[PDB]
Amino acid sequence: AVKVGINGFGRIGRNVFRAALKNPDIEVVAVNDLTDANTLAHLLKYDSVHGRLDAEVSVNGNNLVVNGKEIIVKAERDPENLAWGEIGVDIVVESTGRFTKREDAAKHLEAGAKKVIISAPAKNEDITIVMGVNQDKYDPKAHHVISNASCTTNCLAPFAKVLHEQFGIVRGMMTTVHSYTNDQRILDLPHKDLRRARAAAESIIPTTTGAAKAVALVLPELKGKLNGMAMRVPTPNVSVVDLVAELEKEVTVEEVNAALKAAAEGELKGILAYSEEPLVSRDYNGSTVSSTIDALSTMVIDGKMVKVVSWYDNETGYSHRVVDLAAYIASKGL
Template sequence: MAAPIGSKLKLGINGLGRIGKLTLWHHVARKSFGEIVVNLGRKVGTSLADVAHYIERDSTYGWLHGYLYGHQARTVLTDIDEAKGSLRIDGVPVRFLREKRNPAEIGWAEHGVRLVVDASGQFLDPTAGPDAPKGSARGHLAAGAEKVVVSAPFKVKDKARPMPADAITTIMGVNGNDYNPRAHRIVSAASCTTTCLAHMMRPLINAFGAKRILSASMATVHAATSSQEVLDRLPEAGKTDLRKSRSIMNNIILTSTGAANALRLVIPEMKEIPFIAESVRIPTSAGSLIILVINLQEEPAGGRIDRKAINAIYRRAAADSPEGYLIYTDEQNVSADIIGIPRAAAIIEGHETHTRTAEACIDLAKVPGLDAGLLASMKTQVIRIPVTQAVIYGWYDNENGSYVHMLGDRTVTIAETL
């Protein structure tokens, strides 16, 4: 997927926050598109030079030219033209739009853009029409785009409405092939956490089957995002989550994640598994960790489920992942070690895998719906089931290294069908 698609195809990016900016870096590096059109949706700074300043350097990943060519590289931003709102990044023409925030008013057709990555985080309801007052992903289609990739999970406001037939959630390496270019126009690339979690769960379901996984839970220890405050402030009117108004600089903040719901969209077997997902935010700029806990039913005829068996599953899965979406390692890592790691959706740290096996006692007399006569005929109404609990650790770069690379692969594979 590294080969250029063609010099005539243009990519649109809506929003230049964390994911939008790094998506721009990513596609400049890949040289997959002949031109990139970025919609800022508002005036920024005092000139286009201020936008260039923002693009050229990053507090987490360093200089853009260093990202592209290493520490000895020179600046790659040239030909800044304020009048045209354009510049070149490593030879790739980039045009900036600074007028319209509503996707329906951006005018992608005027600029020859057929594919848009919406990285704004604002237009997540695929059921919303193009004329929605505050805008929608469908507005991009009305403005001339043929396909829209949303860099976040879908959020349907009206739960009674079904998912539209032309919308789908995909994660590369898990259900990426479910995308149908003839049917789908709006594609969610899920989230960084769901992407990592899907690559952690898929090998386990393949190995054991969903029915042997009695329950599962996860907690993501997640780097800060723009939804956290730098310093404490008063909560906005009507807000009930008071922690979101507290400083991320010196706090561990409990929050929520929609990873469990999104996971069911990409791995249908997850609907059979009781699953809980939790999240905490910590004061780091990037690099996150999923702690996955699964409870497995042992089988007398099968081999024992222990640390060695779990790690062997991930070793095989990583070896069968030619794209490098899953990495297995026995090394001892910290979060800084995985920042910027290319493409990997999940890095399994086998050194920390733990298992414990014990018997779960079930009193059949207290199980609703069992026949009373059957219970009376049994010698004992208490059965013991061997259950193994496994704890698995998976690292991911929630920005550039993991998620943006996966988002980029999704975008390029869609572009190849246009």
């Protein structure tokens, strides 16, 4: 397996770690955060959203011990001091949320890693990948700093791919009704985004999203054809994309759902899923797919305007994609 290091052992870092435990291709050997092993161990064992960790965790000296394997714990605020190379770490998952610009993410490379996966939309990255959509575009020689995009983009892109390929998207707009995250605030505090400054668990909070425009990074044909926003709400995990699009081909609900179902069971199995059950957000807590079509919500007007709704566990699905992307990158040679 490829040795992985996780920088920022938080909601995404720990979920990636948990996903990695059940992946034979990658091995997490070290984590970095801003605290001590005791604290990281406690957070890893008991999760308010995902429950008790299905593993034995303990602390040995300054390190974590998980299922008998020692995981080195670092506490370096500056990634340049990480010394990844010294411990054979080849891939670093950059999940602090502070180092989304290449010049920052690349510090892991200076520290000895060979690749960095930024767990968020990035700036100046070598390439942005959405698994199931454009991983074939990854180039092992040219791309060292790779963004895995956002959880919303990972939800929308796979079914946008399907709609576009099968019926052609003329233009479309989305809204994601999205669980709150740690980028928000408990009770009205300063934030660059005056909406995200407001009490997260008390309101429906509109916030801008680059997700629909970011679909263009992975589906160039859709450049300038999409836009949308988010509405953060008082749930702690699980989100849902609501896309309204104008199509080129005339369609029925049955045809749209049938195409989506086909892709889910075929080419996009494990990435896109399809449900005809009348479910609610809690039901998708722990879902590892990127996107699950809520088939009951599909509607069409004039055979040209379609609404497609798709669920995603914003922490889990995206983290499993990070793990898939790391395994994929390792498979192309390091």
